[PDB]
Amino acid sequence: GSHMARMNRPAPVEVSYKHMRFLITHNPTNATLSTFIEDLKKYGATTVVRVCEVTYDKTPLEKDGITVVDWPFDDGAPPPGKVVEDWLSLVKAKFCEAPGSCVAVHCVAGLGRAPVLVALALIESGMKYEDAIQFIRQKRRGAINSKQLTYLEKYRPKQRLRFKDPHTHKTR
Template identity: 45%
Template sequence: MGSDTLVMIPPKSISPSSSTQLCQFIIPTSSLIQYGQMNFLITDRPNEQNMDTFIRELEYYGAKIIVRVCEQTYPIFPLTSHGISVINWEYPDGAPPPPDVIAKWIDLVKRTFKNLHSSLPINQEDNDCKNEGKLPACIAIHCVAGLGRAPVLVAIALMEAGVGYEETILTIRQKRRGAFNQRQLDFLKSYKSTGQLTSLALPLKVKPEKYCGIM
């Protein structure tokens, strides 16, 4: 054999069983989407093996609510024992959300972010919270891969706050590459916003502490 002969060595194959076991320990990837007073953490589905890491991620961002829009494949006790509420709104994979899920989602977003002024310490700017990781409020949401059902609901929230279709898609895809299939894109393009979240479109401003002195 000459020295210039190239010997091709096939890559080591991974059996389906070992591949599945490997995926169980992969840390769920999360993407923070922020607009105005709203903070959403899109993530893929956790499992029992990586749940501790997943919980630390939620706590880092201050997410006390997680919306699960896919099949239930893990116990929720580890989450609820850390003060994290789990909401189950499963709907078919690859499809747009049904009207009842959209209505409940918009209501949840309104209730979560409408009272932030009273929850922030005086003189603490929202940028300070972001730099430390923990936000005044954050909703985590996941489907299986975090590329379809979960991003669609976040997109609806942005559009209800006044963001246009193209900007919404670009904003989410910049953080979550590969998000949305064509059916979901068509749904969002034809979605008619009712403007229910426009009050959350402006950045949160904290009033400065009033000075009180004796003259």
């Protein structure tokens, strides 16, 4: 009312290494749009990856004027890892073009898809499989079973697999 508060909204989380940083926040609410653009943008301005059901795509982006990727889960939601490859390119371009910028992501405090996306984005900084698994491990991420570890494993190159011997034989 005057000086009393209620409800407990998920707390934000910022993941940063070296120079760049990341922001983990909850999707826009219907009671305070402006307050969100200010805080979300307050930390900084860069691409944003929110993987949740779309309710207000224009309100938050148009108010903060920030670039964001809309990843929804419906009857026609692309399940293949290729989707990740899509957000990877988006962040990859925004990462190389904007060194040490400010990114915003969905609240990983629960279970979702944003957490994997974030790690994969920071992967561009070198320690791809190492940073993603290490930085994502520290922070609470969705249910990582097969795709995350298998996908990232393939996401990182290995000379051990590209070991070809000069003298060899072929038949089948």
